[PDB]
Symmetry: C3
Subunit: 199 residues, 3 copies
């Protein structure tokens, strides 16, 4: 249905770095090398520039290497750690599809794989949370974004508590889900407690 | 003449959020829902991401809803508040076309409408300010951008004094005007007091 | 080989301003006027917006005028100062092709010209630094970006020590070089001292 199944924006700490990548090929790689082809469907982080860069970020960028392979197949998306260092994923849909806390950050060690989005499991939540409120379904908006860190992990068991603390990370928007979510939201009504224009 | 009649970039406070939208359809909507189609010509704010986000911004984003409808017709552009909360517009051309101070921020309450750019009124200023200086016509550059806030207002009568203080707002560039302005500027000469390269 | 020979992003101080321009025409101009055509292959800085802008930046933007002409021919790229004020270039490849320190910032006074990238000279470095390490060739990544300031200079002989200190400047990525560099890096191996995921 959508021209792209995902889009990916990259950051270094809390500052967006480089253009947004959009994916139509079902298999995309985000690596740390230097090819600029927006076509190909390699998202190459290595040729993103940043003068604000520091040593701990430069070092990390040199260990992304092969990076992450993100495979869209039917309704599911899996992420594979091709890099020689681990990646770390925070997916609310995956944290649900299992049984973890919504803020759970999972490790995908090198060579490993993980379903990070379940288009079915999501589809439920959608319907379950329709007759559950409006803001109920607004929050699902949070499920269609997945955050992923290269090398350095964050949260429970690390010093880094926020993804914005990690040197190299990406944000993945799943356009499939967002479109279905959109269909639902456009047929509903604003929250209760209206909103002040001054405060 | 131009491929797009406008482009719109969105911010939350003082940080740009999301990609720039470009408009070729004469009617565009900027709403708070979650459709990613760059085609359609709905600019959907709800699927823009931000970890730096805070509670007062999240709340506002949930009241944008239907948002603003921006209608380009002949030379004029009107803005219509479809949202259940008001939008606030700062248009130098509209502040002139009327008689307000250039920094005047106008409210468009829900259901209301307002001509925010007058392609004629602008056209005058252009000619009047040609034989009025160069920096005279450089400043017109400021007229081709319009800033607009959702829900929270800013300036006179609010605590918020700068648009950068508002949680959710957009910046609209009118490519029609800019092109005509460009035609004029390329035939002129730099300002008087030349410029130091050290200070 | 690449769809674009360069891309250029603009900044004001340390904040990215406006969209990235991509160049396929061998001759591009970056000026300070107001045409939005992404086609043309004029990159027009004057119609980039910024509320965070200050007086010293506004003044500079008004002296860019004709700006810089960047000519890609065969393997070489030359930069010509069309502006009435000088531009300042930091090109690691040019600093090498000559004999300067890598951080050397060169002035191109109005009317002047300068080869800022030598596709041959680069080609050497590439091969020389293959059997010289991996991180050896990773650093070449730094050579394919060129930073350029309008009017105000930076570094040795000025108060401004960092390009991020200059009010108006651009970052140019040479996609030719990056692609060849990419070919090389994808056939190699990560650095020695592996990397901690916690620190």
């Amino acid at each position: 249905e959508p021209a792209f199944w995902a889009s990916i924006a990259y950051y270094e700490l809390n500052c967006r770095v480089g253009e947004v990548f959009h994916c139509n090929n079902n298999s995309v790689i985000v690596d740390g090398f230097t090819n600029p082809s927006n076509n190909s469907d390699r998202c190459c982080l290595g040729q993103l520039s940043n003068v604000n860069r520091n040593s701990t970020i430069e070092n990390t960028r040199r260990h992304i290497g092969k990076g992450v392979h993100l495979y869209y197949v039917t309704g599911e998306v899996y992420a594979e750690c091709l890099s020689d260092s681990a990646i770390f994923v925070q997916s609310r849909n995956c944290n649900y599809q299992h049984g973890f806390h919504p803020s759970t950050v999972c490790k995908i060690p090198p060579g490993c794989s993980l379903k990070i989005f379940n288009n079915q499991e999501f589809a439920q939540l959608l319907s379950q949370s329709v007759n559950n409120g409006f803001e109920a379904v607004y929050e699902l908006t949070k499920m269609c974004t997945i955050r992923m860190s290269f090398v350095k992990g964050w949260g429970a068991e690390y010093h880094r508590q926020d993804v914005t603390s990690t040197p190299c990370w990406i944000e993945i928007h799943l356009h499939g889900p967002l479109q279905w979510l959109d269909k639902v939201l456009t047929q509903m009504g604003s929250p209760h407690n209206a909103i002040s224009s001054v405060s």
